Amino acid sequence: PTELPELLKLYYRRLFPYSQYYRWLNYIKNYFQHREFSFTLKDDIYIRYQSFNNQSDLEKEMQKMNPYKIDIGAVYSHRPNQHNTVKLGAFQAQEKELVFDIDMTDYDDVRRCCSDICPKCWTLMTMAIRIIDRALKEDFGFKHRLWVYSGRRGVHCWVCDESVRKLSSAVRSGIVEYLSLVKKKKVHLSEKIHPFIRKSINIIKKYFEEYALVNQDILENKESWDKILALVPETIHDELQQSFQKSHNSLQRWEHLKKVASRYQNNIKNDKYGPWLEWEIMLQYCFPRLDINVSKGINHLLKSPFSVHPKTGRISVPIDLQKVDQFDPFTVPTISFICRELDATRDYKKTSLAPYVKVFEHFLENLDKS
Ligand SMILES: [Mn+2]
Ligand SMILES: [Mn+2]
Ligand SMILES: [Zn+2]
After folding, report:
1. Distance between CA 257 and CA 266 in Å, rounded?
2. Cβ neighbours of 191 (radius 10 Å)
3. Do 75 and 96 form a contact (C-beta atoms < 8 A)?
4. How far is the CA of 123 from the centre of ligand 2 (A)?
C-alpha cells in the first residue's frame, strides 16, 4: 500500500469513469449539487459534507485529494458544503437510495473455513444476491438495482428508483423486516408459507448440496452435526444422531434428517406435517442477514462504487446479475493490475476495468429508459 498514492493518482486521472458516475448521481434541480460525499485521506482522516457543482468540479477535487476512500451520502435540503450557513435544524437529509450491505462476517458462525473469504464460502454471497434481488424486483417492483462488490468481504446493493429514493426510515425498515428471516436457533417459520419464503428456499436449494454438504460438509462429523441438532427439537435428537452414526457422508446424513424432520408433529392435536425444520436449517445456514441500520438510515454513508479498497487494492466493481454465478472476488481488477495493463494496451478504455464499466453503463441505460 506504500505505492497507493501514485496508483490512485493515475487511477483518478485516467480510469475512474467520471461521465458514467455523474450520469448516475445526476439522474430534479440541484440533485447532484445537494449530494454529500465523504473522502478519506491518509491516516483514516476523512472529510464529510463535500458536494460539487458538477462533473468537472468533482473531477478536479478527486484528482487533487486522490482520496483513499469515497463514500456517497444523502441528497440534502441544501448544498452540504454550505451546511454551516444553514439555520439550526434546517439542514436535513432528504433523499437517498435504498441500500443493502451484505458482509461475510455476518455469517462466521456458519462457515468452517474463514473468519477473510475464499471460494468455499462466497456462495453465501451468491445466494444473498439472488434472494434479495429477486424480492426487490419481483415483490417490490423496484426496477433499478446496482449490485457492487465491496472490495473485500461482501456486496452492496443500491436501489435507485425515484420513489424508493424518497422512502422514509419507517418504510425502509418495513422493507428490511419483509426481507429478514434470520434473527441460538435463528429461524422460525410460520405454518402458512409466504411466497418470499418459498422462492428464497428454492434459490437456496439450487446450491445447498454443493455449498453445504460438500464445500462446508456440515454433517461431516460429531461437532459438525451436533450444531445442526441444536436447531431441531430434542425428541428426535437421538434417532437422528444414531442415524448419522450409521451414515458415512454429509449427503446421507442430510437425507435422513429430511426424512425424519418431515415426520415431526408440531401439535399433538393436528395431523399436519412438512418441511419446516429442514427449511429452518437451510435458511439459518444460507439466508442473508440484514443490518437494519444500513438500510434504515437516510443519511447513512456507504462506500462508493468504483472506490478502491485501501487494503486489498480491489476496485468496488458492479456485479453482472446475468452472471452472478460466475462472479469471482479473487479476479477482481486491482488498481495495481489495471495501471500495469496501461503499459501493454496504451489506451485507457482497454483495461480489465472495461466490462465492469459496461455493467454500469447498462444499468444507466435502464435508468434512462425509465
Ligand atoms: Mn457492513
Ligand atoms: Mn461491507
Ligand atoms: Zn471461506
Report:
1. 16
2. 10
3. yes
4. 16
Instruction: State how many domains the chain has.
Output: 1
- Resolution, expressed in angstroms to one decimal: 2.6
CATH code of the domain covering residue 328: 3.90.920.10
What are the two backbone dihedrals, phi and then psi, of residue 58, each rounded to the nearest 5 degrees? Answer: -50, -50
From ligand 1's centre to the CA of 309, what distance in Å? 14
User: Which residues carry a binding-site annotation for Mg(2+)?
Assistant: 101, 103, 291
Q: Which helix (H) or strand (E) holds 222?
A: helix 222-229
- Which experimental approach was used here? X-ray
Active site residues: 36, 101, 103
Contacts 24+ apart (CB under 8 A), 12-18: 12/62, 12/63, 12/66, 13/63, 14/342, 14/348, 15/338, 15/339, 15/348, 15/351, 15/353, 16/62, 16/306, 17/306, 17/357, 17/360, 18/55, 18/58, 18/59
Range of the domain at 37: 1-370
